[PDB]
A paper describes a structure:
GluA4 NTD crystals diffracted to 2.25 Å; the asymmetric unit contained one protomer exhibiting the conserved bilobate PBP-fold seen in all AMPAR and KR NTDs crystallized to date, with its dimeric partner readily observed by crystal symmetry. Overall, GluA4 resembles other AMPAR (GluA1–GluA3) NTDs with root-mean-square deviation (rmsd) values of ∼1.2 Å when superimposing individual NTD protomers and up to 4.1 Å when superimposing the NTD dimers. An interesting difference is His83 projecting from the base of α helix C (αC) across the GluA4 dimer interface; this residue is replaced by Asn in GluA1–A3. At the equivalent position, GluA4-selective Tyr143 side chains stack across the interface, separated by ∼3 Å. GluA4 exhibits interface characteristics similar to those of GluA2 (UL interface LD: 43.7, LL interface LD: 37.2).
The iGluR family harbors three major subfamilies: α-amino-3-hydroxy-5-methyl-4-isozazolepropionic acid receptors (AMPARs), kainate receptors (KRs), and N-methyl-D-aspartate receptors (NMDARs).
Numbering used by the authors:
A (entry chain A), B (entry chain A): 2 to 380
């Protein structure tokens, strides 16, 4: 087994913090005082691309492929998910990603991000929502939209779905205005953080951040966002929190996170978002995987592969099958809790806290896990 | 100007008829008795691939790119739209496609298929639908879904959206059953032809093909499908028909179409579907485009380009800009009527007939064009 293991790093636009987390995890691994933890070094070959279109991601993949990576830690969006996952499976180069889960690809894709679908639907039931509007964007695909619209159709919900991509201050006013005329009181928001911040501001500019309005934020990082105004406005706001900041592992990470040079490690100036936590865990998963391969006595090597992604015929890495099988057997504790997978490479046996906004600030009102579903606190 | 022009042909799964149309148009061009029509020959370099995943489409593109094609006539689906359009724009190789329109790509993509969005929404208004279910699949993206759900949210429609991908006879029964319990009477169906045929059968097995049920079929080929049972059942069925079979141009095509050897030209056994008509027009558009380039005295050549799609830096074809600009200026008559485009490469100044199902069979009840919108017949 090699003393150095080559892995790919494929990051896209506005993922500075995630890359900072990637770098920290790798540093902590390579400088570990524990020979058992680090019998090999991780040598990342990284592309940080700002466009993230399909052509550029394909070129990045092929560049990493020719540099002989055994696996790729990679992010994608709607525009690149298909090429990246397709090239990975075709060539048996395992993809480890913190990006939105995707059912299509079923081999060579390990999806660190657990599904929010069940939790979100369970929540809507508990609250007995029947008429609400769904504000959203499509950067992370259409799964949540489809899940909501299907649940709505089977339950006689009157849901008004509205895409807010490319809305300006005017679009919103009009949007928030009409909304005002219909007297919409309940909302589910599913957007990128940047867009989320903006919508929330608009709602506050509108004065619908007061009681009694209710907002459910459909993401895994309730605490990643500033809700000060809503805490003061008095509106209901519910969300999910995958990362538990009151645990030793997260605490220890935070201890180091706060000491990072914010100029050299952009994104360290704020606490890690859930995507950054997922990225850190991804490195933990890869480290465990290579330790396992080593125990299995599988001397991973890509010699003497041509290194050409467009080679005809395609020449898939023969040891890729072992890598992929071993990845999915990983079961470790991470920033995002129990990290464990099914054969499709999807997270299973996981939990997330459910938070509500109270005067005192965010308060935990329960949790959701894939075995018990929604469990609220009660005396 | 070369006497032979190299073009790409990228066809995916179950596109036999479309390729048959492609071949016929090219044959009719190369064997034209008219020197003005054919001052050059069209030399297609074709890939007919059965999987149609992103890896295979990228490899096909690169193979055609290295064979020195000036443009590519290509089909895609949700899985390949991004790679194909991305590679085309990056390398200034114009894509001419009959596939579902896509707003993202704004250069080097000419979209032969006109939008159905306005027509469909106009239709729902005319009929004053407020409560209906939307049966659909996602092979052609989510535009129609989004358009419906947004229109619904702004108009207080109670729409129940249901995706039917991967439904079997059991899924449908349950589906059609529950539907029965809710007493759903009105439906919009937006699926692939194969899936459409199947749903329609299920509905007939259910007995909801009678009066008074209403079905709106959201596609451009009302006549492409067998509705015999519904003609007899007595249900309302409305749809759109882009190709006018009672015109000299279509008639002449049909004259030759029916004489095709159905073994050598699979798909000729039935009348051309609207996608096949679009494919034929695509060749007409390319022929006109090359005739225009010739008049402009633009001696198109890709010498001595490396021919490597993954070349760094990317070396876009310098004459690609002219090709792309000229494509979009094309204005000709085709099987699908007036073929004309805006600078985004989208169809404009087009019309489609609106058909209803009557005892006598399909009867035209009006039309929709992008200037007049919905115009119904009335005494
Ligand atoms: C605001 O959120 C509170 C959360 O407490 C909602 O009240 C809860 O509703 C659930 C389900 O209806 C009950 O099981 C809890 O007992 C309720 N808690 C309390 C303290 O009342 C409330 O419905 C929401 N109100 C609005 C206007 O959105
Ligand atoms: C869910 O995950 C936990 C680990 O986070 C699993 O608990 C472990 O189970 C093993 C047996 O396989 C015990 O030996 C360990 O002591 C447990 N660790 C704990 C409790 O921290 C649990 O088995 C998983 N449940 C599933 C997969 O159904
Ligand atoms: C079935 O379709 C017929 C189409 O004629 C519908 O009747 C038309 O409705 C439109 C708009 O309401 C009117 O402008 C036409 O004058 C109507 N035509 C006729 C002949 O009545 C009818 O509403 C549909 N019925 C059902 C049950 O779906
Ligand atoms: C819509 O398309 C038709 C062609 O199908 C255009 O009609 C032509 O207009 C030109 C002037 O540019 C006339 O010289 C031709 O005689 C017309 N051909 C016909 C009527 O068959 C029409 O201009 C287009 N309208 C638009 C683009 O607004
Ligand atoms: C050393 O690393 C191995 C593998 O990660 C682990 O089992 C062990 O607990 C570590 N030892 C210490 C002292 O942390
Ligand atoms: C010959 O082709 C040119 C260009 O397509 C066209 O303008 C002309 O009408 C054609 N002539 C005949 C007789 O069809």
């Amino acid at each position: 087994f090699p003393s150095s293991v080559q892995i790919g790093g494929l990051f896209i636009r506005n993922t500075d913090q995630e890359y900072t987390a990637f770098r920290l995890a790798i540093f902590l691994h390579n400088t570990s005082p524990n020979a058992s933890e680090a019998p090999f070094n991780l040598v990342p070959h990284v592309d940080n691309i700002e466009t993230a279109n399909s052509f550029a991601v394909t070129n990045a993949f092929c560049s990493q492929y020719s540099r002989g990576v055994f696996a790729i830690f990679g992010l994608y969006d709607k525009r690149s998910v298909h090429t990246l996952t397709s090239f990975c499976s075709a060539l048996h180069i395992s993809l480890i990603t913190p990006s939105f889960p995707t059912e299509g690809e079923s081999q060579f894709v390990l999806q660190l991000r657990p599904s929010l679908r069940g939790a979100l639907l369970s929540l809507l039931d508990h609250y007995e929502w029947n008429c609400f509007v769904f504000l959203y964007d499509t950067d992370r695909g259409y799964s949540i939209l489809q899940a909501i619209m299907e649940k709505a159709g089977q339950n006689g919900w009157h849901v008004s779905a509205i895409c807010v991509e490319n809305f300006n201050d005017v679009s919103y006013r009009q949007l928030l205005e009409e909304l005002d005329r219909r007297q919409e009181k309940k909302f589910v928001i599913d957007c990128e953080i940047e867009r989320l911040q903006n919508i929330l501001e608009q709602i506050v500019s509108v004065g619908k951040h007061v009681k009694g309005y209710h907002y459910i934020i459909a993401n895994l990082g309730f605490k990643d966002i500033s809700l000060e105004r809503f805490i003061h406005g008095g509106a209901n706001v519910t969300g999910f929190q995958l990362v538990d900041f009151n645990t030793p592992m997260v605490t220890k990470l935070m201890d180091r996170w706060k000491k990072l040079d914010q100029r050299e490690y952009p994104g360290s100036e704020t606490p890690p978002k859930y995507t950054s936590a997922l990225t850190y865990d991804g490195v933990l998963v890869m480290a465990e995987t290579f330790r396992s391969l080593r125990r299995q006595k599988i001397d991973i090597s890509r010699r003497g592969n041509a290194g050409d992604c467009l080679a005809n015929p395609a020449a898939p890495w023969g040891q890729g099958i072992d890598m992929e099988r071993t990845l999915k057997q990983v079961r470790i504790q991470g920033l995002t809790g129990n990290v464990q997978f099914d054969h499709y490479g999807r997270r299973v046996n996981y939990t997330m806290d459910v938070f509500e906004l109270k005067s005192t600030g965010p308060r935990k009102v329960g949790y959701w896990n894939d075995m018990d579903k929604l469990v609220l606190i009660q005396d």
